[PDB]
């Protein structure tokens, strides 16, 4: 056999531009930048620059208007959206768990043994907190209580280590996470998942610094593409909210 589809999770926009609804305008348009197989870029940008766009087109939440999306070569448009969205994983800002065991939202398919899910759970930090839980792995979470969105995040880290996906969408937490702790997760997400390709939606610009490249949303298009270093460097929109975040 051979390995899966997205072999390496090399992703392309192509001229990429979508719309939520048919009466909209374009939320993004134009849209062209070719993310590497295996690297950790972040999407940055003001609030309506169209971060979530790009990861809303990428899991085909909205079809292409203009241009298309291509991962390893193949034209996700033309992919069923069962293996689009089955093979990235997608971590929101508030994950939902559904109602079941904690083991259940780890591993739906039963494709694992309790062994493996702990040695990820492990890996996120969250067997001390799961053993620390009633159930252990059969806690059940909507129930009476949920877990902080920290923590649903890891879950959902560690789900994505057990699934062995090669795309990670990671929108960063804002609301409820310790600003501390959420950057530390981004830290360790290095090194968690060093061979997949991770799409960090950010809305804190201290979790892109580390990124190989950072591409910068402002007003539906594409700004500025490069590494941390380039776009500090060319002293633009990047550049700017980086001073308004205090890093500059």
Known sequence: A?????????????????????????????????IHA???????????????????????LQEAAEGGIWIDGVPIAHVGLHTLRSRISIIPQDPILFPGSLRMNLDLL????????????????????????????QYKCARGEDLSVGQKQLLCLARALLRKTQILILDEATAAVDPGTELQMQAMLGSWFAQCTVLL??????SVMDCARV??????????????????????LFYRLAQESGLV
Do not use: C, N
């Not at 939606?201 to 201290?206: F, G, K, Q, S, V």
């Open 2 to 34: 051979q390995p899966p589809w997205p072999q390496g999770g090399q992703i392309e926009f192509r001229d990429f531009g979508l719309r939520y609804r048919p009466e909209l305008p374009l939320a993004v348009q134009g849209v062209s930048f070719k």
């Open 38 to 60: 295996g690297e950790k870029v972040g999407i940055v940008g003001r609030t309506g620059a169209g971060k979530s766009s790009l990861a809303s087109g990428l899991l085909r």
């Open 110 to 137: 039963q494709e694992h043994s309790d062994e493996a899910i702990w040695a990820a759970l492990e890996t996120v930090q969250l067997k001390a907190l799961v053993a620390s839980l009633p159930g252990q792995l």
């Open 201 to 206: 939606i950010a809305h804190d610009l201290r």
């Open 215 to 236: 591409l910068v949303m402002d007003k539906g298009q594409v700004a500025e593409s490069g590494s941390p270093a380039q776009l500090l460097a060319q002293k633009g």
